[PDB]
User: Fold Maquette-3 from Escherichia coli.
Amino acid sequence: ASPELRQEFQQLIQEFQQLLQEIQQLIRELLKIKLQIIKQLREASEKARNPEKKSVLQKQLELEEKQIELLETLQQTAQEAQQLLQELQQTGQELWQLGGSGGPELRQKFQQLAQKIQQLLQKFQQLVAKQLEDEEKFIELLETILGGSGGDELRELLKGKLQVIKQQRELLQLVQKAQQLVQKLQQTGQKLWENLYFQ
Ligand SMILES: [K+]
Assistant:
């Protein structure tokens, strides 16, 4: 490896490390607003005089607790990715330290780690995409029961849900950026082990 290739690899590891930190911070912010919204849903549900409005709010309250638990799963997934990323860094380091003394075992380990990270991010994207769909569905339902009795708290609940959706789309974009970095690391990886094919 040239200094330029080592630096290219190290820059991608650092960018990805910073991205996973940004993802963990955004999940923490999502958990905070979503727990605040659970309390708003419970309050609105307790106050609701119209049985059809109580019914809608109560059944969404049950789904909300499940969505909170999924976000905590995403925190653990992001942590596992951070651990795999350090192991990928160590495998990259093996490639430039050993250079021509490297063997296929280095490439195999590197590709196994990069594929595990890719699989974690694909699972991550699917779970965020699904939660986003469920948020969009609840908003379409919530819109039908605005005004009349509960009007004020239901409008505040809708404003909250619209902010939640903005943050979940922001989180999807970060996971999509992470999948770009996996491909760049695989491209830089190939440059690190390429010489081993032609000895
Ligand atoms: K060799």
User: Anything to note?
Assistant: Residues 1-199 form one domain. The two ends are 15 Å apart (CA to CA). The pocket of potassium ion is lined by residues 100-103, 196, 199 (CB under 6 Å).
